Structures are given as C-alpha cells and as structure tokens.
Design a protein around this ligand. Structure first.
Ligand SMILES: NC(=O)c1ccc[n+]([C@@H]2O[C@H](COP(=O)([O-])OP(=O)(O)OC[C@H]3O[C@@H](n4cnc5c(N)ncnc54)[C@H](OP(=O)(O)O)[C@@H]3O)[C@@H](O)[C@H]2O)c1
Ligand SMILES: CNC(=O)c1cccc(S(=O)(=O)N2CCc3ccccc3C2)c1
Length: 306
C-alpha cells in the first residue's frame, strides 16, 4: 500500500486501477474486473463519464463495501467531466449524473478530462470558468478533491494565476511512460504541489481510433525487458515502479485476472539509480494518442512540447 497527501489535505493511493475498455468488451466485464482489482489490493479506481462504465464500476465498489472487504473511505474513486460539459453551468449536473450512475454520494476526485472543449466539432470556453464551477462542486461535497487532466504547463498556470482562485488542482492526469516521460512537466507540477498521475503508463491499449499501430510497443522495449530479467519481474512492473520512484501516481488498466494481481507487486521491489537512469534514457516524445480529431484543436496540449 501507500498514499500521497494532496494539496487540499486528502490522500490518494499511489497505484490506481484503470477501468477503460473499448466498446467490443461487454460492460459486465468492468464489474468483474473492478471487484478483482479491489480484492488484489487496488484502492484507487479511475473512471469517467466517457468510459460508459460508471454504473458497473460503482456497483463493483458498492458490492465490495457490502461484503465487508472495504469501507467507502478506504476507496479513492475518480470520475471526469467530459469535454462537451465545460460550460460552467453544465459541470455540477454532469457530476451529479456521474454519482447517480455510480450510486455514490461523492467522488474522491473529479477532473476536467481534457482542455479540448467540444460543442454540447470544437468549442471555445474559458476553462477558468469551468474551474470555478469545479470549485463549487468541492464546496458542496460532491467531490472531495478536484483536478485536471491532459493539461500542459501553460494551461495549468492559467488556472493557478486565476484571480480569486480558491482551490488549486490537486493533480494533472496525463499520458506518461518511459517513451514520453514528461520530466519538465513533472518538475513544474512538483514545484506547485500538484501530483502528476500517469495514464497509459503501460503503453496504452493501442486502440485503432487513436493510436498508430506502427508505433513501438512500450512493453517490448529491450531495456524494460533487460530490467525485468535482472529483477525477475515483468516489463509492466518495471514501467509502474519507475513512476513510483519519480514521485508520479501511476494507473494501470488490466481486464486480466492474472495481470491485475501481478500489478500490485509494484510495491514488492525497487529499482536502483542506474536502472532509473536507463529508463530515463528511453524518453522520445512519443505520445500514443495521436489523432487528427484533436491535433488541430485550439487547446491541444502537445503544441507547446517544443
Ligand atoms: N485522462 C485521460 O485522458 C485518459 C486517457 C487514457 C487512459 N486513462 C485512464 O488510464 C487508465 C490506464 O491507461 P490505458 O487504458 O491506456 O492502459 P495501460 O495502463 O497503459 O495498459 C495498457 C495494456 O497493458 C496491459 N497490461 C496491464 N498489466 C499488464 C501486465 N502486468 N503485463 C502485460 N500487460 C499488462 C493491459 O492489457 P490487459 O487488459 O489484457 O491486461 C492494457 O490494455 C485508463 O484505463 C483510464 O482509466 C485516462
Ligand atoms: C481512456 N480513454 C480516454 O480517457 C480518452 C478517450 C478518447 C479521447 C480522450 S481525450 O481526453 O479527448 N484525449 C487525451 C489527450 C489527447 C492528446 C492528443 C490527441 C488526442 C487526445 C485526446 C480520452
């Protein structure tokens, strides 16, 4: 186990369970694998309105509460505001709908899923107004903590320098792995008392809608394989452990009972400085999400990478 204290005083488990599966996977699987993740030791569960699974995920959590395994307060459940609901008047009802789907009274964490506003086809919205609406959700107790996702440094500073800012984002959940390690952004986050949460920490699910299949497969990397042999673990476990040692909170999606249980072994071993340096050397500006649908968005996060 372990947690990090967020800048609002609440605590977030450093390993999280990724609940996203594509639509060819039946919705009943999300129920089954979330129970298995909880049984394995996961206490941080990551969902979203977009994932069309919140009823299954909440039910998995409610059912592990009902059978005595955990208490509500032992679970860190995250959901996310989808990009068609950035207009400030849409934020609280979107959150209320997510809680009804999950049949929960509050989320531990609510995030702005993306800065790339879409029309309720792109939209123009002052994300600072979105953020104010997020702060009122926290004041109301709908969300214990509030944060952002897919923000670059500039987008984060906009929020941080907002006149009358009441609550800082507790985190920024972003694509992060050995091929796109986000070092500078991570330093910026640490400087501001903001946690970086890694998604696609295992190389993404390589969905054809968003990911070039020609792209290298992170988990076949020769340095990750060589480190997995050295420690007698697996490339996945090397990738997750790398994140914990750099101060990143790391997600891990698996819908496989074996791999779900394996991923919690991240707490059972440690990498050396030289191992960390070798993994650092893999960085190569490779974001797996790489689509026309977003590359030309006015608020695309990766156009400040230069
Ligand atoms: N904020 C956003 O915009 C955003 C974007 C992407 C993802 N997310 C969140 O981040 C979560 C995780 O990222 P992701 O969905 O891209 O997947 P990921 O965590 O990078 O995992 C990718 C693939 O790795 C496999 N895997 C898991 N453990 C493994 C192991 N020990 N050994 C070999 N393979 C293993 C899984 O396949 P199997 O299922 O077959 O095990 C999975 O499909 C998502 O589920 C979602 O909660 C958020
Ligand atoms: C688990 N899948 C998701 O959370 C997800 C799926 C589709 C789209 C999005 S997103 O937040 O609009 N996404 C994330 C960031 C990104 C970066 C470059 C190009 C496209 C995108 C799109 C997230």
């Amino acid at each position: 186990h372990q947690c990090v204290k967020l800048n609002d005083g609440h605590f977030m488990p450093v390993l999280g369970f990724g609940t996203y599966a594509p639509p060819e996977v039946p919705r009943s699987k999300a129920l089954e694998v979330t129970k298995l993740a909880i049984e394995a030791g996961f206490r941080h569960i990551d969902s979203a309105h977009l994932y069309n699974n919140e009823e299954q995920v909440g039910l998995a959590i409610r059912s592990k509460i009902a059978d005595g395994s955990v208490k509500r307060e032992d679970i860190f459940y995250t959901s996310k505001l989808w990009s068609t609901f950035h207009r400030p008047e849409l934020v609280r009802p979107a959150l209320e709908n997510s809680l009804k789907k999950a049949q929960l009274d509050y989320v531990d964490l609510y995030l702005i899923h993306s800065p790339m506003s879409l029309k309720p086809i792109f939209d123009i919205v002052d994300l600072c107004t979105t953020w104010e609406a997020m702060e009122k959700c926290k004041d109301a107790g709908l969300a214990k903590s509030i944060g952002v996702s897919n923000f670059n440094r500039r987008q984060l500073e906009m929020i941080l320098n907002k006149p009358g800012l009441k609550y800082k984002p507790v985190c920024n959940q972003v694509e992060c792995h050995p091929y796109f390690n986000r070092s500078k952004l991570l330093d910026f986050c640490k400087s501001k008392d903001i946690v970086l949460v890694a998604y696609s920490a295992l190389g993404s699910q390589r969905d054809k809608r968003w990911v070039d299949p020609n792209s290298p497969v992170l988990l076949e990397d020769p340095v990750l394989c060589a480190l997995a042999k050295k420690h007698k673990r697996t490339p996945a476990l090397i990738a997750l452990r790398y994140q914990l040692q750099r101060g990143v909170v790391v997600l891990a999606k698996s819908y496989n009972e074996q791999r779900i249980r394996q991923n919690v072994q991240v707490f059972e071993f440690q990498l050396t400085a030289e191992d960390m340096k070798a993994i650092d050397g893999l960085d190569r500006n490779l974001h797996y999400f790489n689509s026309d649908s977003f590359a030309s968005h006015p608020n695309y996060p990766y156009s400040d990478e230069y």
